[PDB]
DNA sequence: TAGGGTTAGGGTTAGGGTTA
């Protein structure tokens, strides 16, 4: 059995605020599909800032690509020497039309409740 | 167009005692030697064992019938029933895809068997037309009462590396049919045509 | 003392607790961690009591491996191939994307595959006289690998009962496909044919350099062993089955010569003279001009099995195992002292356990009041045992591999202009 | 319960039919079948673990034992 | 003389340790 997948907004993982080898699930919008090297570069906006996450895909071929669309990625993170941070994909589904603010508020509320229950112990 | 380019053995149940007569009648040469060795020594190694099991599965033998057949022919080999259940029936269960991954396996083709792993000492798998001595092949043909003209034709076909044509000639001689009329590619074809003749 | 199957499990637990060389074993498997998680993606297959078969047991780290080994206490240890994902989570990835990637090239030699030729023992029995068979087989295969292909690192392991295994562990070989390994095994195989075939060699006038080297390095051993020890040409049925290997044109003459002769030496000399006479008098014969050479190869060459090397996900016994029939521990065989390797002198599990008891007896008055961890205690434990030469040979091989890694990284530094 | 398979045939003449009385009670009386007089140390047919097709039926209790 | 019919209802158990 594997470890569970905790949610993480793109900008935190972009800054490397998670330990190496952790399992995380995040979101973003695809920007490029490097065919030969099996690499995916998705992007997510934050005000005037744009953040990039590198996704290895060696475990989900065959895989259709939808340029300029949202995605959900779940897997493990490995801190490479030069490439930086890349997530090893285990499941990679596509969702469209789902509004970000509801999701962001949802994880914020869940984190708040978890911390509140953590105040008794 | 892609669909067009993309390309585009279930005989009824049989008993457990007619196998000897069918073998003396319906087994092609590429497996008659294996059957004879199994009936003589009551023991066989992996290469012959999977081939024989796949063939018997492909000619209408149930899981229970095959289990009884294997347990009988291996009790004749002086084993222990507990050891049989632990090893041999245990292997046979996944040989038919009863449990485990259950990926059901199709029987080996004639071409694959002829071009399979070359048998060594202590092994009998493989068609005699490819992996047997000419003198032993002639002796075994004479044991099947093959006419001298048929023997010469079989030898010439073997020299020409036309093993399938030699199998066709053997089928025609044993079944007393002037022409087989069907190209041989798989032992299931041979057995089904023999059953149709019967 | 005679090994008994009713006393093994406690000795096995003690061995796994104390003497198993975990440090060196991990050092070999880890390969220095040049590739991320190379060791973490290995497949293991134990075999617990009551002959229950399990597999796909990865290990996160060396300490976890030690703990699981101590808890589980299995019988047989095996090594698989390296996959793209952790084997213990093989059901967590889509089917078809979990494929074997690399494994070490191996060969196997079965002593029992020579029954029709050998006569010293019967079935599963061994004698010191027949050990020369696998000795010369080892020499032939090792020389061929070292010279023809130039593979650097080799490690020979004695299985324990009747076999010896080859563990090629170089770098540019682990990445080979199945076809290349099949070609290797085909090129290294000469004894061809099934049960129905009598003659195992069909050689033309031309002789390959490999065959020439083999026949040159095989003469110095064939004479003594074959003529004196086994005495192939002793009885009537002996030369009766011998003459099946030669054309019938001289069968009666050779039979009469054998009848006249008294010992196998005279019969062999007469066979040599007759063969030499026939070579000068060759008249429309499909047979090769090397009757003596081909019979020596037929009764003397080793026999491999293509199935154990063709597969890439196949399994084979790991070294330092414990055979459940004789208790002899599988140990490496020194390359420079192969001729002085008696199979019967290899230490057994019962003898090594009594040695451990005597070691504790000595420790009762030699080593006292030590506040060390289990690492140093077990280090001195297997130092004091009879396995010291074997672990020393293993360490020397590991040092050779480490020196090779140092050389390759220095070459990479030279190429990359990083000094 | 065992079904008998005697010589197979058809006979249209007189057939005489008989039946024993209290077969199991007679067996118990003759051989002294009781919990306090029967031990379970054998290897006959019934009570053994699944190790093969052989198990344990208790043998005949000794008639010389206490009734 | 004022609601219909009013009825209590499914409420167990199933087995890892496997390859061509």
UniProtKB/Swiss-Prot annotation, chain A:
The record's InterPro entries line, in alphabetical order, gives: NA-bd_OB-fold, Ten1_animal_plant
> What UniProt keywords apply to this chain's record, in alphabetical order?
Chromosome, DNA-binding, Nucleus, Telomere
Task: Provide the leader sequence positions.
Answer: none
Compartments reported by the entry: Nucleus; Chromosome, Telomere
Q: Name one GO biological process term.
A: telomere capping
Where's the DNA-binding part? 1-121
What GO CC terms are in its UniProt record?
A: chromosome, telomeric region; CST complex; nucleoplasm; nucleus
Gene Ontology molecular function, alphabetical:
single-stranded DNA binding; telomerase inhibitor activity; telomeric DNA binding
Under Pfam families, the record lists:
Ten1_2
Origin, by domain of life?
Answer: Eukaryota
Q: Which family does it belong to?
A: Belongs to the TEN1 family.
Tell me the subunit arrangement.
Component of the CST complex, composed of TEN1/C17orf106, CTC1/C17orf68 and STN1; in the complex interacts directly with STN1.
State the function annotated in the UniProt record.
Component of the CST complex proposed to act as a specialized replication factor promoting DNA replication under conditions of replication stress or natural replication barriers such as the telomere duplex. The CST complex binds single-stranded DNA with high affinity in a sequence-independent manner, while isolated subunits bind DNA with low affinity by themselves. Initially the CST complex has been proposed to protect telomeres from DNA degradation. However, the CST complex has been shown to be involved in several aspects of telomere replication.
Write down what this protein is called: CST complex subunit TEN1
| Source species of the chain | Homo sapiens
Source species taxonomy: Eukaryota, Metazoa, Chordata, Craniata, Vertebrata
Name of the gene this protein is made from? TEN1
UniProtKB/Swiss-Prot annotation, chain B:
Q: Which GO terms describe its molecular function?
A: 4 iron, 4 sulfur cluster binding; DNA binding; DNA/RNA hybrid binding; metal ion binding
State if Calcium is listed as a keyword: no
Q: One cellular component GO annotation, for this chain's record?
A: nucleoplasm
Q: Does the keyword Hydrolase apply?
A: no
The ranges of region (Interacts with PRIM1) come to: 9-198
Q: Which domain of life is it from?
A: Eukaryota
| Domain notes for this protein | The RNA:DNA duplex-binding domain interacts with the template phosphates at positions -2, -1, 1, and 2 positioning its bases -1, 1, and 2 for duplex formation. Interacts only with the beta- and gamma-phosphates of triphosphate moiety of initiating NTP of the primer. The side chain of His-46 mimics a RNA base that would be paired with the template nucleotide at position -1 via a hydrogen bond, thereby facilitating the stacking of the initiating NTP.
Would you tell me the protein name for this molecule?
DNA primase large subunit
The shown residues of the full protein are 249 to 455 of 509
Swiss-Prot record, chain C:
What's in the keyword line of the UniProt record? Acetylation, Disease variant, DNA replication, DNA-directed RNA polymerase, Dwarfism, Magnesium, Manganese, Metal-binding, Nucleotidyltransferase, Primosome, Transcription, Transferase, Zinc
Catalytic reaction(s) noted: ssDNA + n NTP = ssDNA/pppN(pN)n-1 hybrid + (n-1) diphosphate
GO MF terms, alphabetically ordered: DNA-directed RNA polymerase activity; magnesium ion binding; ribonucleotide binding; zinc ion binding
Q: Where does Zn(2+) bind?
A: 120-121, 127, 130
| Motif, Zinc knuckle motif: chain positions | 120-130
Tell me what the record says results from residue 76 to A. Answer: Decreases primase activity
Residues reported in the UniProt entry to bind Mg(2+) 1: 108, 110
The record lists Mn(2+) 1 as bound by 108, 110
Q: Looking at the UniProt record for this protein, which Gene Ontology cellular component terms does it annotate, in alphabetical order?
A: alpha DNA polymerase:primase complex; membrane; nucleoplasm
Which residues bind Mn(2+) 2 per the record? 108, 110, 305
Effect recorded for residue 159 to A: Abolishes NTP binding
- Annotated effect of mutating residue 55 to A: Loss of primase activity
Subunit composition? Answer: Heterodimer of a catalytic subunit PRIM1 and a regulatory subunit PRIM2, also known as the DNA primase complex. Interacts with PRIM2 (via C-terminus). Component of the alpha DNA polymerase complex (also known as the alpha DNA polymerase-primase complex) consisting of four subunits: the catalytic subunit POLA1, the regulatory subunit POLA2, and the primase complex subunits PRIM1 and PRIM2 respectively. Within the complex, POLA1 directly interacts with PRIM2.
* Further comment found in the protein's record: The bound zinc ion is not a cofactor. It is bound to a zinc knuckle motif that may be involved in sequence recognition and the binding of ssDNA.
Q: What is this protein's record name?
A: DNA primase small subunit
Q: Which organism is it from?
A: Homo sapiens
Curated annotation (Swiss-Prot), chain D:
| Compartments, as annotated in UniProt | Nucleus; Cytoplasm, Cytosol
**Subunit structure of this chain's protein:** Component of the alpha DNA polymerase complex (also known as the alpha DNA polymerase-primase complex) consisting of four subunits: the catalytic subunit POLA1, the regulatory subunit POLA2, and the primase complex subunits PRIM1 and PRIM2 respectively. Interacts with PARP1; this interaction functions as part of the control of replication fork progression. Interacts with MCM10 and WDHD1; these interactions recruit the polymerase alpha complex to the pre-replicative complex bound to DNA. (Microbial infection) Interacts with SV40 Large T antigen; this interaction allows viral DNA replication.
Q: What else is known?
A: In eukaryotes there are five DNA polymerases: alpha, beta, gamma, delta, and epsilon which are responsible for different reactions of DNA synthesis.
Family in the record: Belongs to the DNA polymerase type-B family.
Entry note about domains: The CysA-type zinc finger is required for PCNA-binding.
The name on file for this protein is DNA polymerase alpha catalytic subunit
Q: Which organism is it from?
A: Homo sapiens
